[PDB]
Every structure is written in C-alpha cells, then in structure tokens.
C-alpha cells in the first residue's frame, strides 16, 4: 500500500481514542447505572 505518514498517524490516534472511549464511556455508564440503582 505504502501508506502516507499522516494516514498512519491518524490510524494510531484512532486506535488510542477507541481504547480510551471504550474504557471511559463504559466506566461512566457503570457509575451512572449504580447511582440510579441506589436511589
């Protein structure tokens, strides 16, 4: 393929952002559901 440097950088950014989203959004949702449950 011989990918460009900008495209490879964007791919690395996308992988990091996907991992960070999958952690943080799931943790926030768990905190919200436990708070709604304890009420």
């Amino acid at each position: 393929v011989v990918a460009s440097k900008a495209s490879s950088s964007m791919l690395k950014i996308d992988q990091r952002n996907k991992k960070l989203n999958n952690r943080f959004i799931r943790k926030a949702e768990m905190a919200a559901v436990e708070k709604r449950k304890l009420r």
Binding site: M10, I13, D14, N17, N21, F24, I25, A28, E29, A32
Partner: protein, 32 residues
C-alpha cells in the same frame, strides 16, 4: 505511572483553580 498510581491524598491536592458519557473522543476511520 499516571494519576491512578498517585496516592489518593495527593490526588485530593489536585484541585481545579469527572468524565461524562456523552462527550466522545473524535475518530477518523469509524467502524462497520
């Protein structure tokens, strides 16, 4: 190490002079 590895009392010393579920981090390739 990171903020998590910091002691909780020292974490309490970091006072602004929590994430929310509806603020996503932007992507470029998406999925599907």
């Amino acid at each position: 190490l990171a903020i998590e590895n910091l002691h909780p009392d020292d974490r309490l010393l970091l006072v602004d002079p929590s994430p929310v579920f509806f603020l996503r981090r932007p992507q470029y390739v998406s999925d599907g």
